[PDB]
Design a protein around this ligand. Sequence first.
Ligand SMILES: Nc1nc2c(ncn2[C@@H]2O[C@H](COP(=O)(O)OP(=O)(O)OP(=O)(O)O)[C@@H](O)[C@H]2O)c(=O)[nH]1
Ligand SMILES: [Mg+2]
Lengths: 999, 170, 8, 9, 7, 19
Amino acid sequence: DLDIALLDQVVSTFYQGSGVQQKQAQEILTKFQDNPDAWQKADQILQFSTNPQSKFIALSILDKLITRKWKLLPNDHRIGIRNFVVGMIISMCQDDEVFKTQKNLINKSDLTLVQILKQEWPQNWPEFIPELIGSSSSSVNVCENNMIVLKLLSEEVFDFSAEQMTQAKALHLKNSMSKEFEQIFKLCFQVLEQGSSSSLIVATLESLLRYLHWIPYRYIYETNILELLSTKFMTSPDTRAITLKCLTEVSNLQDNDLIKRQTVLFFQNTLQQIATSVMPVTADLKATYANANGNDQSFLQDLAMFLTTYLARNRALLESDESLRELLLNAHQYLIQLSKIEERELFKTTLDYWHNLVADLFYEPLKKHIYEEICSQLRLVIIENMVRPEEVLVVENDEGEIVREFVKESDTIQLYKSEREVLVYLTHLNVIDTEEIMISKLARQIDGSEWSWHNINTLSWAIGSISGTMSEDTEKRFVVTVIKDLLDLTVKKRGKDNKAVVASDIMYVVGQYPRFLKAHWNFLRTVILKLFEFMHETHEGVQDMACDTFIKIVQKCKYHFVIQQPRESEPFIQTIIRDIQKTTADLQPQQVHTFYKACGIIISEERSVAERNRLLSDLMQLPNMAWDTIVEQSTANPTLLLDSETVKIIANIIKTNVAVCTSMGADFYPQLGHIYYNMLQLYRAVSSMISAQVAAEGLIATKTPKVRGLRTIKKEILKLVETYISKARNLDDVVKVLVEPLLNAVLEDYMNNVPDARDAEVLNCMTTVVEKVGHMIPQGVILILQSVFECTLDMINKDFTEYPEHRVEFYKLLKVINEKSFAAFLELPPAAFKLFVDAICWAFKHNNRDVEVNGLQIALDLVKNIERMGNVPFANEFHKNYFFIFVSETFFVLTDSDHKSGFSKQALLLMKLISLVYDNKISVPLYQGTSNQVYLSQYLANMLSNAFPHLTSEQIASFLSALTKQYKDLVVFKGTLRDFLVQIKEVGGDPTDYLFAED
Amino acid sequence: VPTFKLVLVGDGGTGKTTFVKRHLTGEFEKKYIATIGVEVHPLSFYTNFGEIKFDVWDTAGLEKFGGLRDGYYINAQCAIIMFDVTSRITYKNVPNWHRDLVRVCENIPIVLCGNKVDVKERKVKAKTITFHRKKNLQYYDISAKSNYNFEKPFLWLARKLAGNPQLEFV
Amino acid sequence: TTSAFGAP
Amino acid sequence: SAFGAPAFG
Amino acid sequence: AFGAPAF
Amino acid sequence: NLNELALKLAGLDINKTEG
Ligand SMILES: Nc1nc2c(ncn2[C@@H]2O[C@H](COP(=O)(O)OP(=O)(O)OP(=O)(O)O)[C@@H](O)[C@H]2O)c(=O)[nH]1
Ligand SMILES: [Mg+2]
């Protein structure tokens, strides 16, 4: 269809054009490259095209042919393609302009040759390596490119062969390269010591970097390549980084004093060479990194990787000899300088090592004196680089509400914890030095020499991280001093801006020292009351700080709020509850809810149940009065929920209940009961209004402010119920009182809602119910299935994309139903059990991990359930009806291109299914005295031959043979499956590959 | 005004397209609609030193939709490698994406991004993420949904490409 | 129950 | 109807 | 499609 | 005891103009 000139035009349009025409050219190119017979256009393209991009694409088409259908080709074609690719590579190498400016095409060509080597070498090309080595002496460019070829070969065989090749083929190629590496190393070594050309030597070092991953130690330690690397190539600016990378891998390669002294030697040479030719230990790397000449940033990255890797493995080697003391401390001084570089990922690399060191010094304090200056330096470095321990996300939800929420397990948070751990160690190693550094840094905030918001915050985070380290008495003197200075600093600073910053840090520090707070009630009470005072401060961030600190402190110190302290006439929680209208008057709703949540934490600490309920009652007085009032108004006004102000008040009422229930859990029951029935009634009301309007106006009604206000009420109600039930201690009251009205209210409404009004949160609510009490409500589970299964399935069985949330929640619900209450399927008509099996297989076919995990898990659990029933009519009938359905469907997703995330579960499921037959657990023939074993093999062989006709009969037999012998060894069984996955994508696969485990 | 080709690669469903389109429209798409081959999106950032433009080549992560695959990488001047912190296998495939990428473009600035850090059940822990170290890649935790480090990848790339460490988006 | 919210 | 009609209280 | 055997 | 410290803390005021 497309001749050469037109292809060149399409390529040029795609890469250099834009917009619609670029898009149109792409679709032409994609079709062209995917054409099975396109490879015959390839050599003509490679011969005649005036476009390097066209040639790149031609090589891709060639690669497809080589990796998939090489063995179909006559031996003439193979040699022809072979000679052509080799010839093409050589031409580009002798062409100096092309060699310099078309590296991507030459690399692509080299990779193509390596693909051929994977097919032909060495059994059909035994002289390749000798032919490669001698061709290197013909031209300096061919020699350089040969290093690239050898590099790619090593990568494809050792680095990326797993899952790309069968285990047998991979072993074959690894052993092949192992047998001929002797002469490869000779060429590599020779070039390294003789070589003039920078680009040649760099390329040689790049290849060696990959060899080091797998080559025998003797090539590294019984030659003198280590000495050559550590002396010659560090003085050179173009080879420094790549040499450090090689030595780093060497530092990851015993009872051997020779190898020990060589390990010491290359480190000694490298460090000496760096100090001599590159930079001294006193070099400001922080500034050097910041200017970033050429690739200096990468060199310093590679240096930190080298030092940390070596020292983590070989520090004890350098310590066992005092002549190496200078080398040891210089290495660590370099690390100190590197740790000052403003580059997080670089800093994290050093920190991982400092953690190793200071832990060792703690458990071996006799070595401590050696590193005293290093540690003192390190204390300051970490203190000055402490990151924030807490992060908050500000997001708009689906109802248009702006919501704060704390980040969990982020990189920043993990970094804080690592920094804290090191600082905790360092504090114990020398508490005086630690205290002196923090105090003097604080003094430099006071005198203004180092004053900034970032620096005072950073220091606060550092100080707040070492609680429980100094002993209680030293801690007391330390915190008193710190709070004193910070209080004076607040007075000293001009501007509400700066004052708020220091004040927030005062509050942060005290919140980090609960032992200090608990020991002194008057001070703790003073802290809380000032936080209350801050809740009236409109200055940005202050109220959030006050509320965050409040709940943080009560989390640690709750006990002191429920008991009656000395010189108090009542537990302070009573004081808090009474003034709650005044305290929270200026807060935003979300902040008020946090306040109530904090009170809930405290009230849960009351051991007397009568008094706990009384406290809860008093706490909820304001929202209950608002709720009671609105309940009364509901009787007097049928159009009550059309008032947006009323809707908003009701929303905040429920949110307040959710907040308190979150912290109180099981203790929240009496409050829940006070509103439960009216709340459920409210739910049906607002959900009806939503569904009615969505039906009349369509999907766009979901975005309207009115509907979103109603859906907020709807979702908060479900959230409240879910929150309590998940925390309930009394499951009887859940079942006997809560569940039945809940199911009637939400399941019926969900069922009668129009599809675009059904909330997936209902399914998630039901999942929580079933998880908690599903084993106690078999009839309730059935009602759930009757209400949500078919109507939800019909929403998600047209495509794989629509209603993404219902899809996830649907199969989460099905999983826990199948887990906790499988009895529900035993009572249901066959037509519905069929729908159940259909739904599972439908989840298999998703390119959606969140859906596919549960689909697999359900299938696994289902087979486990039925197998458990034993020799019983239901189990036996299931086997006749569905055994091969699951077998073939599992084999389908296994062999399909994009279901790799479920591979582990698929393999397990297949093992389990095979177990049912080859362990004779199925008491009944599966076919309409032939044993089930041989009918299974016949089914599979026929299934596989049909689906993959290019497979030989011996391939299939050998595969099924291995499978039915390995179904109890997961690791081996997986390996056999991966081998099969490799072989179904190519032609002429070796059937003896499946004997890999046995030999 | 300089235009820089940016190639965006990573496993399917990691959030590459939703990341780009939120940068373009401000909207966050909930549905997973797999990209087929590649889509090119002009994306401008106004800085304190004027406009900088990216031609974002949003490539397909699913194998059946891969298209030209590494053919898309030609003339790339920078790159983002994306994975999903809720899915271990997407991080496991990072070396594979990086491999195909640098074989075409041997010395371009590359950012590794762990997306979806807003999700509660995080599977790829922060301590585990170290691949970028030996490859000299930048790394960021990001969330296209909750606006966490949302502009960091483009900011770092812009500074690297413009050779200006003081570059800020305005 | 004690309320009569209803759906207008 | 395949699962049977729901009986709501 | 939804109800069909994949193979 | 920390009465002196508690009193100081109680005086914490970001709206005073005594910088
Ligand atoms: N929770 C959460 N979900 C996200 C985030 N980013 C994206 N997603 C979701 O993840 C899915 C990813 O969608 P896409 O952006 O199209 O995935 P992709 O990387 O482009 O996949 P391919 O086009 O096949 O290569 C979408 O359903 C998004 O809604 C995130 O930051 N947090
Ligand atoms: Mg996409």
